Design a protein around this ligand. Structure first.
Ligand SMILES: *[C@@H]1O[C@H](CO)[C@@H](O)[C@H](O)[C@H]1NC(C)=O
Lengths: 245, 65, 145
């Protein structure tokens, strides 16, 4: 079922154990692959039959190890066949394979070195985002006020398609600060942090623009949102059936 | 005289039948992309040979509703 | 070098009634608001006080609908005071913003942000300058917005 891909160079697998365990706790046959010191390549398809139902791409730096296991064309062929994806692109860990796959789906994430900065921050240390910026009840509806710890993060520019499901918004004051002199990638509340996609085939993708959102350290702040997010991504939360028209 | 470069590719229709002497030709409308992108873009993707992208440049796309 | 703000709002038709109609969150607010009657550039002046303007941005949209645009300024440093000018073209505005404003009665509003990382908390500026009430009935019936 689920396939987990991770790089032990950028972020170890243990830091994201809680949520994976919860998956195990609900009968998720996780198969774990590491891309740092592996040569064999996973074959998503065996004679035109996909071997997995979902896939998780934990934070990885761009390299030729990712471009070999999940090339863009294989990702699009998996996605057209109803596979569900869960990407994660922190600043300083944005692969070109994810970035290009998501530029094909309409979502334009900021590239490396573009870090969102908010000066009207609750806590100056890291980018905490309140729960008022949630933009879809079906994905997740907060009953009470929550402050999500997002760490260093990036933003996404969204096209005007029917398939894109925005989920969270950057703070209205917040802006991206590129190390270079290029203008801000996103300026205000037009940069999205969490984003989702649903095909016409009902396959679902979700992009989280931080690497610290799903870490064990921030478990208490971000457990309800994270668990409902993963349930939505895997077609387990808000699926609808029409009967007997 | 018709040369191979006088005929641009068809990105929205498939050939399904062509009679024996090429007198009747039947094409079929292909269903739109699941990802909701124009079929010309799918084509120009499946044709353009693999090469490094020109650069990473902020897209001019407008305002998200 | 303290700053003097001018919002040169270039127009296309019956612009509106820029005005700070109701009392708002007054965190280091604008010292005063003003206007001029010139047709080509109905510039609006306001000499507000920033603390450090590393972030200097004017958002001309509807905050509730999340439709906002970010307008950078133009800084001229005389050496005693710095002059900021934001030039807004009513014609070159997002189609969705125009349509949303026309379809439902509400005023397009302009919020100013001046801030810095090194600034003390509560010394940054995030305040609504004006609320234009557009009147030109010129909107397209059908568009992809
Ligand atoms: C895989 O392991 C480490 C991560 O701990 C990585 O830095 C290295 O490049 C790889 N190879 C070896 C031998 O560690």
């Amino acid at each position: 079922r689920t396939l987990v891909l991770y790089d032990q160079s950028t972020e170890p697998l243990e830091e994201y154990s809680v949520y994976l365990k919860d998956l195990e706790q609900r009968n998720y046959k996780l198969e774990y692959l590491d891309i740092n010191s592996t040569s064999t390549t996973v074959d998503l398809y065996d004679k035109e039959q996909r071997l997995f139902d979902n896939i998780i791409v934990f934070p990885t730096k761009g390299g030729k190890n990712l471009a070999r296991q999940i090339p863009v064309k294989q990702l699009i062929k998996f996605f057209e066949n109803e596979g569900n994806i869960l990407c994660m692109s922190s600043p300083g860990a944005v692969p070109n394979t994810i970035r290009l796959f998501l530029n094909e789906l309409g979502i334009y994430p900021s590239p490396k070195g573009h870090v969102i900065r908010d000066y009207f921050s609750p806590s100056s240390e890291e980018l905490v985002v309140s729960s008022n910026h949630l933009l879809n009840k079906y994905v997740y509806n907060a009953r009470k006020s929550e402050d999500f710890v997002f760490g260093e993060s990036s933003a996404a520019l969204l096209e005007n398609r029917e398939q894109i499901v925005p989920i969270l918004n950057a703070p209205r004051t917040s802006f991206t600060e590129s190390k270079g002199k290029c203008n801000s990638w996103t300026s205000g509340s037009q940069g999205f942090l969490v984003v989702g996609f649903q095909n016409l085939n009902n396959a679902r993708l979700v992009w989280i623009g931080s690497s610290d959102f799903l870490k064990n350290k921030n478990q208490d702040s971000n457990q309800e949102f994270a668990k409902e997010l993963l349930k939505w991504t895997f077609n387990e939360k808000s699926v609808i059936k029409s009967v007997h028209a | 005289m018709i040369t191979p470069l006088d005929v641009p590719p068809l990105d929205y229709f498939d050939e399904v039948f062509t009679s024996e002497n090429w007198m009747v030709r039947i094409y079929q409308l292909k269903k739109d992309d699941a990802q909701g992108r124009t079929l010309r873009d799918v084509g120009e993707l499946t044709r353009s040979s693999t090469k490094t992208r020109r650069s990473i440049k902020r897209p001019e796309l407008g305002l998200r509703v | 070098h303290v700053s003097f703000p001018s919002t040169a709002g270039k127009s296309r038709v019956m612009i509106g009634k820029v005005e700070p109609r109701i009392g708002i969150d007054e965190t280091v607010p604008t010292t005063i608001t003003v206007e001029d009657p010139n047709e080509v550039i109905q510039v609006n002046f306001a000499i507000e006080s920033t603390n450090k303007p590393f972030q200097n941005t004017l958002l001309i949209g509807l905050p509730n609908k999340n439709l906002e645009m970010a307008f950078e300024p133009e800084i001229k440093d005389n050496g005693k005071l710095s002059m900021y000018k934001y030039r807004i073209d009513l014609a070159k505005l997002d189609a969705a913003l125009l349509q949303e404003a026309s379809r439902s009665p509400e005023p397009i509003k302009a919020t100013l942000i001046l801030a810095s990382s090194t600034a003390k908390p509560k010394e940054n500026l995030f305040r609504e300058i004006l609320q234009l009430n557009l009147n030109f009935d010129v909107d397209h019936s059908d568009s992809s917005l």
